[PDB]
Motif scaffolding. Structure first.
Motif, PDB file in Angstrom:
ATOM      1  N   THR A   1      19.109 -49.986  -0.448  1.00 51.03           N
ATOM      2  CA  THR A   1      17.838 -49.285  -0.491  1.00 51.03           C
ATOM      3  C   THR A   1      16.949 -50.004  -1.490  1.00 51.03           C
ATOM      4  O   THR A   1      17.396 -50.791  -2.286  1.00 51.03           O
ATOM      5  N   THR A   2      15.681 -49.659  -1.469  1.00 48.30           N
ATOM      6  CA  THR A   2      14.733 -50.080  -2.479  1.00 48.30           C
ATOM      7  C   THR A   2      14.428 -48.882  -3.360  1.00 48.30           C
ATOM      8  O   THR A   2      14.745 -47.768  -2.952  1.00 48.30           O
ATOM      9  N   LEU A   3      13.801 -49.136  -4.513  1.00 44.76           N
ATOM     10  CA  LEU A   3      13.428 -48.046  -5.413  1.00 44.76           C
ATOM     11  C   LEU A   3      12.433 -47.138  -4.698  1.00 44.76           C
ATOM     12  O   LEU A   3      12.594 -45.929  -4.697  1.00 44.76           O
ATOM     13  N   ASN A   4      11.477 -47.720  -3.959  1.00 47.17           N
ATOM     14  CA  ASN A   4      10.518 -46.912  -3.219  1.00 47.17           C
ATOM     15  C   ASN A   4      11.193 -46.000  -2.203  1.00 47.17           C
ATOM     16  O   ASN A   4      10.884 -44.807  -2.130  1.00 47.17           O
ATOM     17  N   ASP A   5      12.081 -46.552  -1.365  1.00 48.39           N
ATOM     18  CA  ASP A   5      12.682 -45.796  -0.278  1.00 48.39           C
ATOM     19  C   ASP A   5      13.650 -44.771  -0.846  1.00 48.39           C
ATOM     20  O   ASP A   5      13.791 -43.685  -0.289  1.00 48.39           O
ATOM     21  N   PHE A   6      14.320 -45.147  -1.937  1.00 49.63           N
ATOM     22  CA  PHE A   6      15.207 -44.203  -2.595  1.00 49.63           C
ATOM     23  C   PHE A   6      14.420 -42.973  -3.062  1.00 49.63           C
ATOM     24  O   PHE A   6      14.832 -41.843  -2.781  1.00 49.63           O
ATOM     25  N   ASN A   7      13.313 -43.222  -3.774  1.00 50.59           N
ATOM     26  CA  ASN A   7      12.471 -42.167  -4.329  1.00 50.59           C
ATOM     27  C   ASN A   7      11.911 -41.221  -3.271  1.00 50.59           C
ATOM     28  O   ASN A   7      11.826 -40.013  -3.527  1.00 50.59           O
ATOM     29  N   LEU A   8      11.587 -41.738  -2.084  1.00 52.52           N
ATOM     30  CA  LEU A   8      11.124 -40.879  -0.998  1.00 52.52           C
ATOM     31  C   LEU A   8      12.187 -39.848  -0.637  1.00 52.52           C
ATOM     32  O   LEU A   8      11.880 -38.661  -0.443  1.00 52.52           O
ATOM     33  N   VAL A   9      13.433 -40.311  -0.535  1.00 50.99           N
ATOM     34  CA  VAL A   9      14.538 -39.415  -0.271  1.00 50.99           C
ATOM     35  C   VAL A   9      14.785 -38.503  -1.476  1.00 50.99           C
ATOM     36  O   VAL A   9      15.042 -37.298  -1.327  1.00 50.99           O
ATOM     37  N   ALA A  10      14.810 -39.079  -2.679  1.00 47.72           N
ATOM     38  CA  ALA A  10      15.126 -38.285  -3.863  1.00 47.72           C
ATOM     39  C   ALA A  10      14.201 -37.076  -3.935  1.00 47.72           C
ATOM     40  O   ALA A  10      14.616 -35.932  -4.187  1.00 47.72           O
ATOM     41  N   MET A  11      12.915 -37.331  -3.737  1.00 46.75           N
ATOM     42  CA  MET A  11      11.972 -36.254  -3.916  1.00 46.75           C
ATOM     43  C   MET A  11      12.109 -35.192  -2.817  1.00 46.75           C
ATOM     44  O   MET A  11      11.849 -34.012  -3.071  1.00 46.75           O
ATOM     45  N   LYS A  12      12.583 -35.571  -1.623  1.00 46.33           N
ATOM     46  CA  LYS A  12      12.862 -34.623  -0.547  1.00 46.33           C
ATOM     47  C   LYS A  12      13.940 -33.605  -0.939  1.00 46.33           C
ATOM     48  O   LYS A  12      13.973 -32.488  -0.430  1.00 46.33           O
ATOM     49  N   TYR A  13      14.830 -33.979  -1.867  1.00 45.03           N
ATOM     50  CA  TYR A  13      15.935 -33.141  -2.315  1.00 45.03           C
ATOM     51  C   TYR A  13      15.699 -32.593  -3.727  1.00 45.03           C
ATOM     52  O   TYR A  13      16.644 -32.098  -4.352  1.00 45.03           O
ATOM     53  N   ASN A  14      14.455 -32.666  -4.210  1.00 46.22           N
ATOM     54  CA  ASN A  14      14.046 -32.174  -5.520  1.00 46.22           C
ATOM     55  C   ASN A  14      14.858 -32.842  -6.630  1.00 46.22           C
ATOM     56  O   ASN A  14      15.290 -32.183  -7.585  1.00 46.22           O
ATOM     57  N   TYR A  15      15.159 -34.133  -6.431  1.00 43.59           N
ATOM     58  CA  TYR A  15      15.608 -35.004  -7.509  1.00 43.59           C
ATOM     59  C   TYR A  15      14.428 -35.689  -8.195  1.00 43.59           C
ATOM     60  O   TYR A  15      13.396 -35.959  -7.599  1.00 43.59           O
ATOM     61  N   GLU A  16      14.538 -35.882  -9.503  1.00 44.08           N
ATOM     62  CA  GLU A  16      13.553 -36.626 -10.285  1.00 44.08           C
ATOM     63  C   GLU A  16      13.405 -38.043  -9.712  1.00 44.08           C
ATOM     64  O   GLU A  16      14.364 -38.707  -9.282  1.00 44.08           O
ATOM     65  N   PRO A  17      12.178 -38.591  -9.696  1.00 41.01           N
ATOM     66  CA  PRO A  17      12.008 -39.989  -9.333  1.00 41.01           C
ATOM     67  C   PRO A  17      12.762 -40.908 -10.291  1.00 41.01           C
ATOM     68  O   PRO A  17      12.887 -40.632 -11.482  1.00 41.01           O
ATOM     69  N   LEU A  18      13.355 -41.953  -9.717  1.00 42.99           N
ATOM     70  CA  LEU A  18      14.037 -42.949 -10.517  1.00 42.99           C
ATOM     71  C   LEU A  18      13.017 -44.021 -10.892  1.00 42.99           C
ATOM     72  O   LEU A  18      12.290 -44.481 -10.039  1.00 42.99           O
ATOM     73  N   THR A  19      12.906 -44.317 -12.176  1.00 46.35           N
ATOM     74  CA  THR A  19      11.948 -45.282 -12.696  1.00 46.35           C
ATOM     75  C   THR A  19      12.652 -46.580 -13.078  1.00 46.35           C
ATOM     76  O   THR A  19      13.872 -46.612 -13.191  1.00 46.35           O
ATOM     77  N   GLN A  20      11.875 -47.627 -13.354  1.00 49.93           N
ATOM     78  CA  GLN A  20      12.480 -48.887 -13.762  1.00 49.93           C
ATOM     79  C   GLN A  20      13.212 -48.709 -15.091  1.00 49.93           C
ATOM     80  O   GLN A  20      14.195 -49.378 -15.364  1.00 49.93           O
ATOM     81  N   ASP A  21      12.706 -47.862 -15.955  1.00 50.06           N
ATOM     82  CA  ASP A  21      13.367 -47.632 -17.224  1.00 50.06           C
ATOM     83  C   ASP A  21      14.758 -47.068 -16.955  1.00 50.06           C
ATOM     84  O   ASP A  21      15.725 -47.459 -17.616  1.00 50.06           O
ATOM     85  N   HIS A  22      14.838 -46.139 -15.994  1.00 48.68           N
ATOM     86  CA  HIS A  22      16.128 -45.550 -15.640  1.00 48.68           C
ATOM     87  C   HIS A  22      17.063 -46.626 -15.075  1.00 48.68           C
ATOM     88  O   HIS A  22      18.233 -46.726 -15.458  1.00 48.68           O
ATOM     89  N   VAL A  23      16.531 -47.505 -14.229  1.00 45.37           N
ATOM     90  CA  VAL A  23      17.307 -48.624 -13.704  1.00 45.37           C
ATOM     91  C   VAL A  23      17.834 -49.474 -14.844  1.00 45.37           C
ATOM     92  O   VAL A  23      18.985 -49.883 -14.832  1.00 45.37           O
ATOM     93  N   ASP A  24      16.984 -49.752 -15.844  1.00 43.81           N
ATOM     94  CA  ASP A  24      17.380 -50.546 -16.997  1.00 43.81           C
ATOM     95  C   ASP A  24      18.462 -49.849 -17.828  1.00 43.81           C
ATOM     96  O   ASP A  24      19.399 -50.527 -18.294  1.00 43.81           O
ATOM     97  N   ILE A  25      18.375 -48.524 -18.024  1.00 42.25           N
ATOM     98  CA  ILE A  25      19.353 -47.863 -18.892  1.00 42.25           C
ATOM     99  C   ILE A  25      20.705 -47.771 -18.201  1.00 42.25           C
ATOM    100  O   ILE A  25      21.705 -47.629 -18.915  1.00 42.25           O
ATOM    101  N   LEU A  26      20.736 -47.905 -16.880  1.00 43.80           N
ATOM    102  CA  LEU A  26      22.000 -47.935 -16.133  1.00 43.80           C
ATOM    103  C   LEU A  26      22.604 -49.342 -16.116  1.00 43.80           C
ATOM    104  O   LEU A  26      23.709 -49.540 -15.621  1.00 43.80           O
ATOM    105  N   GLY A  27      21.927 -50.313 -16.740  1.00 47.46           N
ATOM    106  CA  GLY A  27      22.386 -51.691 -16.743  1.00 47.46           C
ATOM    107  C   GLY A  27      23.839 -51.844 -17.199  1.00 47.46           C
ATOM    108  O   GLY A  27      24.635 -52.513 -16.520  1.00 47.46           O
ATOM    109  N   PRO A  28      24.195 -51.340 -18.393  1.00 50.19           N
ATOM    110  CA  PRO A  28      25.573 -51.472 -18.869  1.00 50.19           C
ATOM    111  C   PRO A  28      26.621 -50.973 -17.877  1.00 50.19           C
ATOM    112  O   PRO A  28      27.651 -51.624 -17.646  1.00 50.19           O
ATOM    113  N   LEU A  29      26.408 -49.788 -17.270  1.00 52.79           N
ATOM    114  CA  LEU A  29      27.388 -49.295 -16.316  1.00 52.79           C
ATOM    115  C   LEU A  29      27.444 -50.146 -15.047  1.00 52.79           C
ATOM    116  O   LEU A  29      28.492 -50.301 -14.418  1.00 52.79           O
TER     117      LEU A  29
END
Ligand SMILES: *[C@](O)(C(N)=O)[C@H](C[C@@H]1CCNC1=O)NC(=O)[C@H](CC1CC1)n1cncc(NC(=O)OC(C)(C)C)c1=O
Ligand SMILES: CC(C)(C)OC(=O)Nc1cncn([C@@H](CC2CC2)C(=O)N[C@@H](C[C@@H]2CCNC2=O)[C@H](O)C(N)=O)c1=O
Lengths: 305, 304
Positions: B225-253
């Motif tokens: 998926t892309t961040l854009n396409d992911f976010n379209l789905v996320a928001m359909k399920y009342n999940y918070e949008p995923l931002t680049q900062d969030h992508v960066d903080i998941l880097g270590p894992l």
């Protein structure tokens, strides 16, 4: 309002955790008065762990082979002995923070708090149940051995668990503070597997009572069941038999909520048979079995220490 | 291995808990150096609670009206002031068990431990998250006000929450230790509402990485998926949008597991669209959102 997996406050236990090092191996010990209690496998090298002869390994160790640190202070070991699977190190100093305490052996179905420690330093606390198969579903990495489980019982810390090993499926095994394993396990690096686990039925019912107390009522129905019929159904879901003692134990929660135990058993029956239909209970999509009836009363009544 | 909801060890905070009584109202206070911090509504009776005038209620109090008990010992109050929704009582003794500490204001999605107290005495510890709607899902009875939430880093306790009220849905609201509420809540007996919450996506992803670390791998797929396409789905399920900062903080894992963040997003997208189809992850049949990336690394790498 609300219901959370809740641990006992850990402060009294934090003041007893020390670091024990023997050669390559460092793990945790429990310092009570002038004795440090730790897993006996601290004396094993990786190689020794396949087939350790503990008597023979320990007779080769001097007191000088044990380094015990309490924060930034080294404790001098002036004696050592082994009791079952626990090593007891006599040290020259009594711990000034020793709480009133006892060693207890808990029973399957009972809960306790674990203080996970690495390098003699507490890292976190969480609640565990002794599973029917004598394992715990813990969170323990290399370095956590000698972490303990406890309850606070009136004016007393009751130590019930010391951590030794991981088994298949990522569950855990250990001893009481006399060094006796819960369950058929041994402290060697070997092919060991626990029995099939089962659900602790009395605990599920207690948690359903917690849910009612917290205004979560959707699963209540107007049906009832006999204890025998309930057991006929629950065994098909790998639930433990509910005994008449368990029924009697749930009486206080029954009186508080106005829901008879066998009516709650009929509700549980219907959840097993039909499922939850996409609904949750106290935030869970599965039925929770690691709160005892006493744990529910403690949390719902705000008991303190 | 294993993965549990884990709180910080509570002892450093236990040593700071006191009982504060003003007339017939008793709740908990936090004793740091020579100051006790507690909710300002300690000075209210039930009659004042409808619409209290706190400035005036406070002025009518004197130092002797505040009974502060630290275990056996009564502490002498020698000054009082109000900062936002918190009362600060100056006492004549500095708490010798004061840890290194700081006051911080946390952001939604961040987690903290709570030491629930009654009558200045600890009852239990548990882990909470600040929800997107600025509530927490705690466990708090009458008497619990003044209980605090905290994180520990090295030897330093960061206090982030002080408990004040329960809201209709069975969730909780409070302040930071400067007395400012999280969210739009106020300390009066008005009808008040949290309103709809959303799922903390970055935390769900962190927890899926925890699952992988622990050997639960069934939900990994070969989809993209892309961040854009992911976010379209996320928001359909009342999940918070995923931002680049969030992508960066998941880097270590992501590095630890070798699973790219957007590949884990492709996994989450499938779980949201299809459900878990009778399987569980780390013992749960719901996607868990109250572990932060730091919480997962801490637990799956064992910091002390
Ligand atoms: C403990 O000694 C310590 N230093 O922390 C350690 C704790 C385990 C590490 C990973 N999770 C733990 O709970 N315990 C061990 O290493 C034991 C020591 C033996 C009992 C004497 N041990 C040793 N070798 C292997 C295992 N487990 C294992 O291989 O488990 C699987 C079969 C892979 C699931 C073990 O626990
Ligand atoms: C309708 C329901 C859902 C039941 O919600 C209320 O009616 N809420 C409230 C109404 N009026 C006042 N408060 C606060 C005080 C005000 C000024 C902010 C309150 O009572 N807080 C307490 C802690 C509370 C009570 C139980 N659970 C808790 O979390 C407390 O101060 C301590 N002494 O414990 C409320 O929370």
């Amino acid at each position: 309002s609300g219901f959370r997996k809740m641990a006992f406050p850990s402060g009294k236990v934090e003041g007893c955790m020390v670091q024990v090092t023997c050669g390559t191996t460092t793990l945790n010990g429990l310092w009570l008065d002038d004795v440090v209690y730790c897993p006996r496998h601290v004396i094993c090298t990786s190689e020794d762990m396949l087939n350790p002869n503990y008597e023979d390994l320990l007779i080769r160790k001097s007191n000088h082979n044990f380094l015990v640190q309490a924060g930034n202070v080294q404790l001098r070991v002036i004696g050592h002995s082994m009791q079952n699977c626990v090593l007891k190190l006599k040290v020259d100093t009594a711990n000034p923070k020793t709480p009133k305490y006892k060693f207890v052996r808990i029973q399957p179905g009972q809960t306790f708090s674990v203080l996970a420690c690495y390098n003699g330093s507490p890292s976190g606390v969480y609640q565990c149940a002794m599973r029917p198969n004598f394992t715990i579903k813990g969170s323990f990495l290399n370095g956590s051995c000698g972490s303990v489980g406890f309850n606070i019982d009136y004016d007393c810390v009751s130590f019930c668990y010391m951590h030794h090993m991981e088994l298949p499926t990522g569950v855990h095994a250990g001893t009481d503070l006399e060094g006796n394993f819960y369950g058929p396990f041994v402290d060697r690096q070997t092919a060991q597997a626990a029995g099939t686990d089962t659900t602790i039925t009395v605990n599920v019912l207690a948690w359903l009572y917690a849910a009612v107390i917290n205004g979560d009522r959707w699963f209540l129905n107007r049906f009832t069941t006999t204890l025998n019929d309930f057991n006929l159904v629950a065994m098909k879901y790998n639930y433990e038999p509910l005994t008449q003692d368990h029924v009697d134990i749930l009486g206080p929660l029954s009186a508080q909520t106005g829901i008879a135990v066998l009516d709650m058993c009929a509700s549980l029956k219907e959840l097993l048979q039909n499922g939850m239909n996409g609904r949750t209970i106290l935030g869970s999509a599965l039925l929770e079995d690691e709160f005892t009836p006493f744990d529910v009363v403690r949390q719902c009544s705000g008991v303190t220490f």
